[model samples]
Each structure stands twice: as C-alpha cells, then as structure tokens.
Target: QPEPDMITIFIGTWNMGNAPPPKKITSWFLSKGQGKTRDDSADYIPHDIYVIGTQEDPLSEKEWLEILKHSLQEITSVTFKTVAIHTLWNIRIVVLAKPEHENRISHICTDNVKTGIANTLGNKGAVGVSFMFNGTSLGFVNSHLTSGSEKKLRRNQNYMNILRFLALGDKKLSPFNITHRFTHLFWFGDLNYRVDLPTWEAETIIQKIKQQQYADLLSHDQLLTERREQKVFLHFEEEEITFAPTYRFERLTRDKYAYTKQKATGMKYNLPSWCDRVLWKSYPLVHVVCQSYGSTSDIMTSDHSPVFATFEAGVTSQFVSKNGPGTVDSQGQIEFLRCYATLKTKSQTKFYLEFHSSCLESFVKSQEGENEEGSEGELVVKFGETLPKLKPIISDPEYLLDQHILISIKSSDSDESYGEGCIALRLEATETQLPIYTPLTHHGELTGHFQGEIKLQTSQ
Candidate 1:
C-alpha cells in the first residue's frame, strides 16, 4: 500500500489583539512574527498549518493567509488553503487541504453554530466549516471558549450550547448517529479551561462531553465513550502538563514598573504556558505524528503559544516493511495498540514477539524516568524530561507494552552503535520485518572504523 499523506494541522490561539489603543500587546508579536522567528533554532522557521488567531483585525485576514503561504514553501508536493476567514472576536475555521484533495472537495460551508450560544451560555463562540472532499465528507470547527473569570458560567454554558448544536443542529441536513454519512468530525481551538482542576473536577468536564457522544480524538477510538478520554497538554517555556502548575507566566515574572532605570522597561518576556489547547474528534484521523503545545521558555510567539496536531491517514506506508520496526506518532499509537490488542489474543509467538518488541521499545525510553540526555559530547541534551510525565498510553495489564518484549535499556541515554567501543545491538526479523535503519545504515561504516567494536550482537 502507498504511504498516507499527512494533514498537518497547526492550531493556535494567538492573542494578536491589534485593537487600537496602547501598542504594548502588539509589540510582543514583533519578535515572534515573520522574518524574526524560527523553530527550535533561530534559522529554522516555525510554520503554522492554520493560524486561527483571536483579535485578528478585519484587515489582517489577508496577512494571515500570506503568512501561511510563506511559511510552508517547502512542501512542493502539496498545496495549502485557508478554508475560512474569521473576524476579530469569535470562532474561525481555517481548513488547509492537500492539493490531491482539491479535486475531492466539492462544496465548502461556514457558519456560527448557535446551539449553545443563546441566553443560557452567553459567551459561546464557534465557527465551523464543512467540506465535501471528492467523495468523502469532513467537518472542521474552530472554537475559542471563554476564560476562568466569573464569566466561566457563561463559557460553560456556551460550550454546552455548542455541544447541543453539534449534536442536534445538523438534524435538518445530515441524519444523526449513522456511520458513513459524515464519518469524521474535527473540533479544534482553545477551550480556555483551567488545567489545574482537581481530578474529579476535570473528570466532570470529560464525563459531560462523553455523554454528548463526541470522541476526543486525541484519546482513542475504542475508548470513545469516556469524556476526558484524551490527554490535553499545555507547553510553554519548557513546561508541559500531563499534570503540573498548569499555568506559568513566563512573560511576566517581574513587576513591569520595578525594572532598573538602565534596562528595558515593562515585563520581560516570559515563556508561554499550556493554558491554551487542542482537541480532536476520533474517527477520521487514526494517526497523530507529532503534537506540541509549542515552547516552554521565554521565546514564545504568543501569550497562549501554539498547539499543533499532525494527522496521517490511509494505509500504512509502502516504505514500511511488513515486519520492520516502524515509527508511529500520537495517532499511530492508538492504531498500533488496536491492532496489537486483537493480535495478542491469538496463539502465535511470531505475532506476539513483534508486538512485544514494539511495546518494550516504547517503554525503554521511560525507564530512566526524567533524565533524557542526548549526547552531542560535552553539550548533552538533558531535555524532554516531561515526556514521561504523560499518562502511560498502554494502561491494561494484559495490554502491557512489556508483554511483547525484547531488549531493555537501563539508562535514558542508552547507546546502540555498530562500531568499536560502543555496545553492539543485534536485531533480526524476517526480511520484511527489519526496520528501515536509514540514519544508522548510512552512517555506520564511516563511524564503524573509528570505533573499536560495535557490530550487532548477533554478528559478533
């Protein structure tokens, strides 16, 4: 089968309030915006799939579109589009469809779904767009829920109203609960809810949503009935929360007026936090390649930062061998588990072994706990400690990643090299089962000679 094309969705809640008045708010975006910003490195620019910015001026829609076009010039194979334009205040749905999907998309519709926006929930703001992709149907909705002020009552009410609309609003158009009519729905945006809620409080929100029958796509398909089925992480200035302080004001640590006379005034730049969010509806997108509640340090682009979810759909890659070790992202984790869940029940060692190896490899990275060191010599990378903080994906004893095991690493920075001095790690599988060891394959011989001995243990 051919490799699936990815629909990389960059969801953000940028407080780019270009509203007239004090220009302080707009100043922060200057360093982070075009020409000045980049990804992890200063030179590698960060690109957003869809910039659903709030406080977006009536005139800036064209600017945002230009921003998208400029950021993604690398993917020549795919063409991108901003499906809908949003105003300064409310909901905006921007859908970027792949060029191949262009022919598939027949009609595009956008509107304000007022189910939960009436007298009950006053601040409910939602903008949605439906697309007819060739023969398939997909709906995308972008939302900006109200904050934690006394106004939360309004926010919650709004969400409830929105939920009501999603559930029953489409009654006049498409029939409800039927499988293939509209197989997938993606709800993206910043649900400005607090992350520090007590477990039960958090569970209450999860339970409420689950009752409405919307699968938190960030979670998993089989477990769709659970409310907080998926994990919502907020990353700002090097902090991510599966659980934590929830919100850290990286851009505002010092009193703005307290700065010394010689230095720059006002609040020094603080890292962005995880207060913003991203949520998915779990049917159409089966794989999540990478997700980040961007940046945990002072170099943040926006107060809420950006949240992204990249989805891979269709058959497993043709490049992926039948038995080779494969790389799976957030969404792929669920699919792999679902496949393993069914296969593990069978009485076959080969199937069991493959699954075990995958599961074991996944956990080995966590054994060292919070110390993940990337050795680039003296400048080692002691980063990604927060990854282990995430709730373990494989929760069941029978479904333990350890059950399909092979080798285990004692340290977070365990080394494996096919060269001298370094330890040799031998792995064998059917011809189709071997992993696509590109980086290692290409670099081995050159480095292999310098090292004393690092051949596969089997080869040794």
Candidate 2:
C-alpha cells in the first residue's frame, strides 16, 4: 500500500460576535454536514487537515487555543499539530494537521493584513497560513473583511490589500504572495457581503429562502457579483450554496435570525444575507474537489452561525514515486531485499499508525487524566514516518531481485539532487529480523536513519 491519492482538508469560520467559545462546539469541526438526511455513523473519519478561523473571539489567546485544539482532538481523536496559529487581536487563524501529515508538510508560515479603522486596527482584518503539502502549495486566509452590505468596494479593497501584504514566510525577504503563489487558496470568513434588491421589492426572495431557493437568494450576492465581473477574486470558485445563510442569527438563539425593529412597518430584520462564506481558487489542471459545504446551525454561540467546507485535493510528487525505482538527496529511503522490504524517512515519514476506534474512545484515552489506565494505548503504533511499497512487476524473481534490488530516496525540492540506490539481491525471507540504518551528511547535515526488516526465508 502507498500514500493516498487525494487528501481531505476541512475549513470552518465564524464571527463570534465577541463571545467566548462554547463548551460544546465540535459540530463545527465534523466533516459531515449537520442538519440533513446525510448524517453519518460514529466510525468518525475526520478530515486529514483542519483550518479554523474566527472573528470577535473574546477569550484570551491561550484559552482560545486550548478550546479549539481540544475541540479538534475530541472530534478526530488523533494527534493534531498546530503547524500555524496566528492571532491579530480578536481575529484568529489556525491550521492543524494530523501527525502523519506533519512530515509531508513544509514551509509553515503565517501573516496578517489589517483592514480595520484607518487600516491600523485588528478589529477587522485577515490572518493567513501557507505551506507545501506533499509538494503541493496551499494557502488559507481567515478574514473579517469590511462589514456592512453597502461596503462592497471597501471589502474588495481589503481583499486586495490582504493579497498584497499577507506574505507566507517573510514579508520583506521572500514575500511569498498568498494569492498568486499557491496552487490552491482558500479565502473564508465573515465576508459581510449582502443580498441586493431594490427598496421594498417584495417578500418573495425571503419567502423563497424559506423554501430553500438559494438560486434566487444568491442572484444578488455582492461577492458573487464582484467575482463574476473579475473585479475581485478573479479566478476564485465557490460550491453552490446548498446551506442556508450563515449570518445575523439572533444572539444566543439556535436557528433564528436576528431581527431589528423598523418604525414604518411590522418587525423588520437586518437583510438576511450569506455574510459568512467559504470560497476557493485553484490552479488550472490541478485537482481540488469540494466535498461538502454547509453551516452548523446547532452551534449558535454568537450573533452569526458557523460555516464549514471540506475539500479533497491531490498532492504533487512528495511521498509518491510512481513508476520509478530510486532517487538522490531524498528526505527518505525505500529498500527491498528479496522478501525483505522497509521504508524509512529521515525527516518526517515517521507517521504513527492509528487504527480506527470510536472517537469518544480515542478522546477519553488521550484526555482522561494524564496518568490513566490506558492513556497511551498500544493501538497507536509507531511505524516508519515514511514508506514506499513500490516494486515493479518483473518476471523471474531470482533474476529480478539480483539485478534490481530496488531502493530509492527522494526530495521534491530543486535545491537538492535526485538520489537512487540499487543493492545486489538474493531470495532470503525472515530468518532473522535486522533493521538497517544508513546515515547521510550534507549541507543541511541530514542525520536520520533508514532500515527495514523482513521475516521467514522459506524454501522456494
């Protein structure tokens, strides 16, 4: 078996309306969309990656981190490393990856662009995270753009400013532009774009909203309008709005819209708009599929509900070395010795194998006190952080293993040379298990070991 062809990423954003995180908000992190005929079972396979952003977070940074981290750990019941977590005042952007992906992920960097009062405050702005995943560059932006329905141009300007300023690694040095530099870019948050209809048009659009007619509801969306005109988010694409609007919900109420009083008529509410949004852009010829997009109406912790989207993206040539035998200057190595085979990663291919278990079981096993009965369960096995099970189909195993005892090491970076090694072979099975280690020294002082063992040499 080899690396998965497509990896899943989950993005969830919410405007907290200055409220602290609720004790139970795991629904916002679940990959399965809530409120549907599509509810899933408890097998609970979480996304491979999670990017969560928020506006008006009232808790301190430490408190917020613990809660969000705890929330993810609960839902997924796996080790999630916060590769990137950045905060600018009340706005926060977090990127979390499963431990298995840690080795394959690189260039973890973050930045922020202020778009608040005089463009100097953190009250409204964006923070970003960018990294290379299995050699595929990805960017994520969590923004609280200029609010108010009429501030469409201002929101566009803020987006442009974010693109110009939110560099991935170093702003003054490398200045990796978040928009133009990535293969896939996700821009999501309290976008604050509104529905536009002439004054006193009718109750029909609202009436139709009640009947799940988003086609008409989105007809006048400001963000969609600007994107269509190519004024902002030029090549960005959004999945159809299968979920209801995710903004202006009545504070502290679940599944109710916030209403404001008007003197001229019966109760008038703030124009219900899809203010919270999830939109993405990808390079042509790249594969990025929107697996699901919807709002978690059950998590009514603030004036706005939370919205979520999941994507399955294909990675570039990182761990995958299809139709190949070997490499040079690679971060890891794969070896074959007749019935013997093993893969070793020098840097990060050391992902621990996590067999499926109940989410609650995994969570309880991890957090049910630091020193519990089965805190560190043996179910989570420590295996090669990296492995390649690639062995071409060649006739005559005796001739094949002797000529091409296939071994390969690879790095997707251009700064290094390609490395490949072929060892002389024989037909030997597990008579004894011996782990092999090869150490390399270089400019980066590569200092990891690679070794594999196979068992039982049987009579042929």
Candidate 3:
C-alpha cells in the first residue's frame, strides 16, 4: 500500500532560565506574535503533533504538566493528548499527539544524561523521549549543553554523551542506545555553542542583524562550523537562522540586546549568540521537510528567546520490519504490530490483551478450561514469577484471538492483594513451529510494567 502524506508538527524550545511562567503559553505554542490571539489568524494552522522542550523549567513538574494540559485543551479543542512527558532536573521534554493517534504510539520511554560537575547531579545535561509514531521510531532530545565561549569541544562531548544515553530500564543488563534506536530524531534546547568571533567583531555583526544581514553573522556560528567539519550531530540538519540571535537579550529592555552590557561590563558579560536551536534527522522510511524555523523576539521574559520549527514529516509503514529481538515474523517476513495490556479491578484483578496485526488472516479456534491449549489456536500471556500467578482462561479462543485480541484475565485472590510485574505474550501457531512473541526482556521492545496502587477510604 502507498504511504500517507506528511503530517505537520510544531517543535519549540525555550531556555526559560527560571523566568516567571507565562499565564498563557498557548499563543507562544502557536508561534503567534505579541498580543496576537487565534482569532487574528493569518498563517495559523494547528499542527498534528506539538513538541515542547524546556531548559531551566520554572514551575514544578506537576504544575507544568497541568499548565500544558490546560493550554493544549484550550487551543487544540482537546483534540491533542500527551504521549510522553519527562524531566531531568530543570530540563524537560514533552510530546503531544492527536487523539486518533493514541493507539499508534507505543513503546514509550524516556532517558537522561548528566554532564554536571560530578556527572551525577542534573544541573547540566539532556532529557529525551522515544516512541513508535505510526510504526516509525521517533526520538526527541531536550539538551542544555556546556556553556561558555571556549567550551565548544565540551559542548560537542555533551552531545556525544546524550547519544550514548539509555532509557530508564535495565541500565546495565540491556543497553539501548538512543542514536541507533530511532528512525526519525529531533534535538533542541540551549545548546550554548557560541560564535567564534571576538567581542568587537561579534558586536559589529550583531549590528547588521536589524538590517536582515544576520546570515553574514551566522557564518561564524560555532555550531555550523562543527557540523560542516563533522565534529558533532553527524547527520542532523538545522534550518538557517535568518532572524536575530536568540541569546543575551536585555532583561528589562525588550528592544535591546545584552551585547551593550557586554561592552560596558568588560569580560564577565556573555556575548550575544544564537544559542537556542532545533535540528532533526530522518531515515529512509521517514522524510522530515523543514517548513519554517525562527525565534520569537516579542517574548523577552528570559535572556534567550524561544525558537520554533514547523515540519512536515512523511512516514511509510512498508518499512515496518524486524528491528530488535523477539519480533513477530510471518513467512520469513517481519512485521511491527501494535500491542498493549490494560489492567482493571472490581472484585478480581483483570488484564486485557489488545493488539493489531496485518498478517494474521482469520481466527479459527475454540477453548475453555485451565492450562488447556486449543486445537484451532491459542495465545498465552506469561507474567513470570515476579507477579502473582494467574491461570490463562480462553473461553472462545476464536473471538478472543484476532487483530484486536481482547483476552480476559483474573488474579488468584479476589481480595485486595495485587501484584506488579511485566507481561510477555506468546501466540500459539499450530502451522508454524515458532509462535509470535513480543520482546519484553530487552530494553526498547514492547516493555511496559504493570503495577497497582493501594487506596484507602473511610466511610463519611
């Protein structure tokens, strides 16, 4: 089948530097100008996906989460939902997908790397999220690299550190490298790569920025030089910075750049630079078309202005094949299928198995009883010894086993004692010797932990 057309995405990054949180970030998210609302739309279009990466987040993680939820609902008409949200110290990254794409996004995971003073504290580092977006693995990284004029090599090393980071799960036992895992990737934040020119020369170039001659200044951008020399971000591509530099703006004077202070304050002041940025890369199955990229000068709460990128991401399912271990295969051809487990409890604990398959044709099976394998077909989900033992009961295997496999589950105890553990599914194929199985023991393959929380209530 032919692949679908490109999907629009809005990616933005801001190094708030503990600035006061804006009451309404919806306009900011939409990239609207100062005092501009949705009603004043000229070239405004709600995107299919919205990614917001922040460094030096001012609000608590809980508070930011609620604020984002409320802001998204207000702008997207509650059509977009949170796919993944993760934070490391002050750095945070969030991915919001449309409601219809909830089921298509799976294998959700997050990771972080600390390059701080001790390499343990997260004062400086990167936070990232990886997931399957329509069967194409996508990873988003929000990084705050080393800062300073002479720290270009250190900043490059920070990028390498983020590439080597693994998601949260089996850190030592099963290593999952971020760079090799995703088909499409995006990296954005206050990378802090400075301009190579001296203060006088940089200030002279900054002067021409207002005349729309910023390209001449960008020639000395350290990040671009590194990319040209293949020093870092090997395959990633960033849009040209036609706008003014984003960093070192005056806190009080919105119209002024901080270079004025740099000249008067001597060597201690930081030079003006395009520190905040967005870059992306895509594999053969996916194509990332850069639509628009620039910084918002109207927002001056922080020294660094917010940078945003609009992309048209094209993806095809034909590239769905075996990536890691324990993938489902049909007739020597591998397939990437969507699978998940849902837990519910009223009197007894119940786990439901849901999945979508393209290869599996029909359901030909029937069974009912404990530990009995049906002649037609059967699917067994093993929770292993870590969780409470539960018998596999398939009353109508035919109805329970199909593209949308809705298998019933039960716990050994009818009371309140519930256990937490992971699941591994095994599909019984009477024709083939090997059945389908999702790799849960590995790092990135369909690994989701199921647990229960205790809640006590007093009769009032």
Off by over 4 Å in 1: 1-8, 17-59, 74-79, 86-90, 114-124, 149-153, 166-182, 196-273, 284-302, 315-460
- State the lDDT of candidate 3 residue by residue for 1-460, as single tens digits: 3434467777889998688666766656666542112234623456778889999888777787788778777776665688888888889998888777777677787888888466535488988887766645677888999878788999888887776664632232122345434556788999998777776665576677666676666788899998988788765688766667788887644576776434444454466788988998664324677776877656667877888787878643423333212342322321212222222222323333221122223211112112323234433333332221111222122211211221223333331212122212222432232322222211112222222221111111
| Candidate 2 deviant stretches above 4 angstroms | 31-43, 116-122, 169-176, 199-205, 259-269, 319-460
Candidate 1 lDDT over 161-242, as tens digits, reads 4543543122322212111113234555555543333333433434533353322322322112122321221110111223
**TM-score preference between candidates 1 and 2, better one:** 2
Query: Per-prediction RMSD in angstroms?
Result: 19.7, 18.3, 15.8
Candidate 1 local Cα displacement, residue 56, angstroms = 5.9
**Candidate 2 structure, TM-score to reference:** 0.64
* Local accuracy by lDDT, each model: 0.32, 0.60, 0.58
Q: What root-mean-square deviation over C-alphas does model 1 reach?
A: 19.7
Residue 280 lDDT (model 3): 88
